[PDB]
């Protein structure tokens, strides 16, 4: 019975950038196809004066080659009708890294605690996402209380993304 068109998903009302911002770490990520950040995910956000938001991301990636790599990533985020969603341009210091844009839609987010992100990369003929990925962030480290652990699985279930999720490890590679 669950709708799992892309155009049915729930977004963040009223999303507010600079409440965003800062520093946020990824605790679990649903993996898309291809290549892609591993772990020791750290995004910090921030907003400039004309209210244009961009982001910085530093990763562990592994290359086709097997090669380890801290990849140091730049986004800039185009607004849209709906301010919970942005395309987001993106692309990487070093020149080898993948450049790209995606769509980058904030599904929910309480800014203080928690924030689940996601982006449909392909989507079927029936509107239902061929090829995704999706992030949950944490404002602490640590990461969450069991409240809002319960909080986090429902928008999962919400997004038909439902146990694909991983958790993501920091263990200072990438410091
Ligand atoms: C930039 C940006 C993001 C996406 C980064 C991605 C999609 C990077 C892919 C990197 C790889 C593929 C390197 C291999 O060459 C996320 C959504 C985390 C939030 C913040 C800023």
Redesign the pocket.
Known sequence: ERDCRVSSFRVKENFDKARFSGTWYAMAKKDPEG???QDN?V?EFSVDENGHMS?T?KGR?RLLNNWDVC?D???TFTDTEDPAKFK?K?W?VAS???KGN?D?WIIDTDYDTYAV?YSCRLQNLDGTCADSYS?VFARDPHGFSPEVQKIVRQRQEELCLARQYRIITHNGYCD
Do not use: C, E, K, S
């Open positions: 290549l892609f950040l995910i995004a982001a991301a990636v990849a990533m730049v986004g987001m993106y990487g080898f890294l993948q995606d980058h992100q992030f």
